[PDB]
Amino acid sequence: XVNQHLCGSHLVEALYLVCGERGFFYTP
């Protein structure tokens, strides 16, 4: 679903910032 896809794009960026040197796990 496109709304979820666009949301996920922002989520990745937010995780990038928030998680810093810890990094993150993106599972859709």
**Contact yes or no for 26/12 (Cβ under 8 A):** yes
Please report, as ranges, the residues that interact with ligand Cc1cccc(O)c1 according to CB under 6 A.
Answer: 2, 5, 7, 10-11, 14, 17
Give least dist CB 27 to ligand Cc1cccc(O)c1, A. 15
**Sign of the torsion angle spanned by Cα atoms 22, 18, 20, 15:** positive
Binding to another protein (CB under 8 A) within 1-28 occurs at 1-5, 7-8, 11, 14-15, 17-20, 22-28
- Rounded to whole angstroms, how far apart are CA atoms 6 and 23? 21
Binding site for Cl ion (CB under 5 A): 6
